[model samples]
Target chain A: NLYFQSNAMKTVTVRDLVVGEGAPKIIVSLMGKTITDVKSEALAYREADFDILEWRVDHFANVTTAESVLEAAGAIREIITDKPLLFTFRSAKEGGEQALTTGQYIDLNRAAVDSGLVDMIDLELFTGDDEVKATVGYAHQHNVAVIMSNHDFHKTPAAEEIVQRLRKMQELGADIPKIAVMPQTKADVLTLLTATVEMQERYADRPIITMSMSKTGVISRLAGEVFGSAATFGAVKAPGQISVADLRTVLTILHQ
Target chain B: NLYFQSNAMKTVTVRDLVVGEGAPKIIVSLMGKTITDVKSEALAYREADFDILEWRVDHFANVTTAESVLEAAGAIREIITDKPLLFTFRSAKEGGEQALTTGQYIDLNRAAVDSGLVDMIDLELFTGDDEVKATVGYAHQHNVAVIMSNHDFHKTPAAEEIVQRLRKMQELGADIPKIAVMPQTKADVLTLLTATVEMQERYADRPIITMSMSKTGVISRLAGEVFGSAATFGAVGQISVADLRTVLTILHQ
Candidate 1:
């Protein structure tokens, strides 16, 4: 079922940018309260040379209906055309403000995919197996990639559990697997990194994104290349997120 | 025989400085042509706040006699008093300029230890089992800690082999185990770091020093704390060595 046995994961190309190939790509999230604010943020990020732009729809105050979310996605698409735009509706239980049911989440993601404005959609893995498979099937049908994600803000899971979570994403047909957890201790961050290394080495077929949140996890953000993580998340305003410019500076050296 | 099993090794105290505790200590090598040059460099490094100063006696032009070596060590001691000084005569095969037979190597190291100026002595692990034991025993008798070292300027071995070398140092009674290898690829540096992490977790009884050489391996030098490398080598001017105070300032934060 797997194609590559080398230390690196197979490169997944989105538009002109490539993930999991040479240098690790910087994926910064766009968060704002309105379409105007979100578009402004997207335009600002376009000049920053970030590889991928993630539209965190959960952060948009005007995203009440599926239509509104699609419109915002379209607005950002027009602002930064052809740049890989990822639509993410992080659920409330998984450390996001969105309180949508599984059906609502699937319908919203399906509408976003149907709009042809977004390059990728982040589907939460614990949204029930049928809903997840449906979303993945719909996204693939629309020529959009699926980034299956899991977040544990309280504590980092054991290495085996972390691997299992990412492996499950691959089984559910995710194009990319992502997991972000808060680490209480330095060893917890090491556990996250070690799990990522093992996942990239033996288990996962595609590039995976893994992060240990907060100051204790800062090193994890910079050490993705050494640990085999494919992409890193940066935010202009996130608790554990380093600035995109700082991440770029560090990644340049790390990739070299 | 080990004192603890936590992720951190027991703190190896040398004078006021401690290694294997919180922050990694920056160790700069003092390699000058003469005693005056060596003393001046030692004083400058002392002000730079390097935790350990390695007196690379093999760099000296007049180290033909044991008394001369001792006198130089004494002069550096006077210049950098109370600072932890490591006496090292890096062998030619192991990337050093010196060409010493096993007997002469043993004699020089024994003389350095007996001089009472150095806090530790670096002994090459491949100097035969008997010679290593003899040197380690003599250093111990003179209250000097031993840093058992191996260097490969050619290539890094497999992770298992690298760990085996460090574990062998423990078996041969090295107070600290050290290994430096040149990496041909990025993955080679990763291999070295992975081995250091595994060794600290499973095998090493004391702190260990591991490095992947050259510019490509520079990350391995900065990432010692993450990989459990207790001491990192720095210099006033060496391609591999970064600025000591700058490294310490960053590592401090």
Candidate 2:
């Protein structure tokens, strides 16, 4: 019974490109701090070697209204050219810097998708079923990928539960299921690794990004790609977060 | 293909009471900063409400020799009385304070077991196969339970891989399979919980102590029993590093 679920979920891979097991595909996330000055942000990416740009709309001081949403997305596309962009207005509830009302936040999300300025978006699983379905539907109509995500700054959960949560997200129509929890102890770290291996070995085909956050789970994020994680989040300019260069080193280390 | 590894080895459950799994048992560690005051470390175990006093011999100033191990163990036992005792010199590589030669560490372990001063002993997994086996065999000969442990301060492994490692330890004749790693993020924490539940559900028959170290995994240690861990380590004195009373407070909070 346990093995059955692992075998059932289709797989997807996201590197520089995306390939899905079926209809939809998993996409990668790129992060930028301020989005108001969209040209500067896009210019930075155009010069960089990265594949996609994730518009961290939450990091802006001016993203409080619907008009700003459209303006920021438009400026971002102008600079980045045709590269795919993902919109994320991460609220404080999900470890973001801002705290907006659910209604205000949904409106901002809706405006971004309606603007036709981005190719994909990130929807936190904790946002509730109704919001996730609505946003996913909106994104789908625009041919945008929707990544369902969760962040746990505390302890790890049971392995089976992690699988269950991912499966639920899949059933909820997420193009991919992403999860991050803290591993305080080595045993906790092992739990994350085992889940990744099992999910990849058994149910893999659909793109999944299950990783632990923090210095301990840093290896999981890098080595996780080998274990079935299609893509990992690397900080471009944030302090206290791992950088892209260190990620490349880990990639080399694990590859060897 | 990770199945169960029958320990067929002697096990001392939580509280150092030989048990075969009914309710979660309690086990606490004893620490001392120096050999001269090691007896006082054992005496402090009463206030800490510990069932077993894990005599950390590495803290002594002059325990590099086998003779000092006898001195520390005997002194700790004299203070602890009938309570089940465990001795560990701790390999530096295994997150311990002192550094002991593999041969010397094994010999010191053997000396503690031979002295009949403690009820059990802890050996790091990184110990040589021969050294681990020798110390385990020697301890078993004296009816002292053996705990084989591994520490991963770096990162979390996958849940299934962790179970495989634990299964391997169990098969190696360890009375208890102990694992500890650091958690840098939430996902790493998930790995720990997932591994614990998976191991207990599929393979573990004897007691297992798995913890996520650091501030992130601290809650895991406090709540590990509920998550399928058999027992947790608590500071007994300044030297022994598990906090027993904090557990009660944490559970209440």
Candidate 3:
């Protein structure tokens, strides 16, 4: 791990594709609440244009049950067979539907890794550092990559603080570090992009994902390649999420 | 004029089109080199998706002759008479075909206005203050709006400096103040957008135009609706008119 860290985690391979090397990848989150809903969404997603399929597990009704969680993962995997499946159980504290203690979150992630149904798992950065390091190591042992994330729903922090948080995530052995912040002003969006540039160019050993939420921050989403974000969110209607069709169009034009 | 200045020139009306009151308007430049080239390009542009037609006067080989200039302008007006026509004689320092002395440049613009062949004229901001002000007044007397402009093909200036330049143009009595700069780095693009927001929110009583040139700075070109640039250049160029219009409409929502 140290060798790869020192050598640079420039790219992370999941399934057959390589991310962090070419154009920024597209990630769409699935928020199906029932097994039927999950399967239906999974089937529909196969036709959509995206690089990664993130299963937002907390939205499932029976999320606390280990068997039911794996059951949901299996249904999605069966329907969408090709793309990388990212198991993400977002906490209520971070723009999500449910809440879980650190211990519950840790066990839930461990179960998902052991089931071998998910290609990657998202671990919130504020999770206890010692536990985060261990869970990241355990996931690595199972060949499941970890995407460490932080979210600020109220306002964007300073660029220095954002860079430090990403660096901390890197030090925790995360395969890809991600941060999403809500911008209170137009300049806040520029602040997020500024931190993205500083982190990617001066500090990052691997690719990092960063976004400034809402309409004012849309430029950060489309200008990721020029400003240094590895991927951007879409496929769901959120604060400033562009539709997959429009998002793909803009990304392609910018990439060209 | 001071009445309009103190009263806040929030919108400039040119041929029934009101700029600076809504979504940024799209303007495309026509760079035809001959009388036939101008006629052909104008016919092709008649079918293009744009709001304003800009005839790049510097691209003409016979630009020095007043009669030939009026002839080409007349051809464009005949082919596409509905949209606004903007006459621009760019100088070599500003990334255009040829160089013209101050008096010659000022004379060419006055000729375009006197001939009644254009709806607006673009006078570079650096054209001596007295000359630019007088030419602007001349265009207004002929019922032609003026889109005063400045260009930095090399690099973007500081945000404060950019605002100062645009402010100076407005003070000199330009109907629409515009500036385009090249970005040397990613942050330089941000600086251009920053300047746009600052100028629009704080100092601008009149409409203003701003852009960062080339591929890396394309974000500045498309995000005008949010940042407050009154108009943007487009089509048959770096980004197609259809694509520019599409993105502009999307962002407008």
Leading candidate by TM-score:
3
Question: TM-score, each model?
Answer: 0.72, 0.48, 0.95
* lDDT to native, each model: 0.79, 0.65, 0.85
DockQ of 1: 0.13
Residue B38: error of model 2 in Å?
A: 50
Residue-level lDDT tens digits of model 3 in A74-167: 8888888878889999988787899888889899999999998899999999988899999999999888989999999899999999999999
Residue-level lDDT of model 1, residues A1-256, one tens digit each, is: 1112222446677776777876678888888889889888977777785788898888888666666777788789888886788899899889887687777777788888888888888999999999999889988877888889999999999999999999999999888899999887656776887788788877877788999888657767776766777888766543455777767766765564
lDDT tens per residue, model 3, B1-253: 1112222548877766778766778898889889899898889888888888999999999988989998898899999888889999998888889888888998999999888778888999987878887888888877788888999999999999999999999888788899999998888888998889888889888888999998888888788877878788987527888888878877776
TM-score of predicted chain B, candidate 1: 0.91
What TM-score is obtained for chain B in each of the predicted models?
A: 0.91, 0.84, 0.95
TM-score of 2: 0.48
lDDT of 2 at A169: 79
Best by lDDT: 3
Ranking 2 against 3 by TM-score, winner: 3
Grade the docking of candidate 1: incorrect
- Per candidate, the number of residue pairs that clash is 0, 69, 0
Q: Predictions ranked by TM-score, top down?
A: 3, 1, 2
Q: What is residue A50's positional error in candidate 1, in angstroms?
A: 3.6
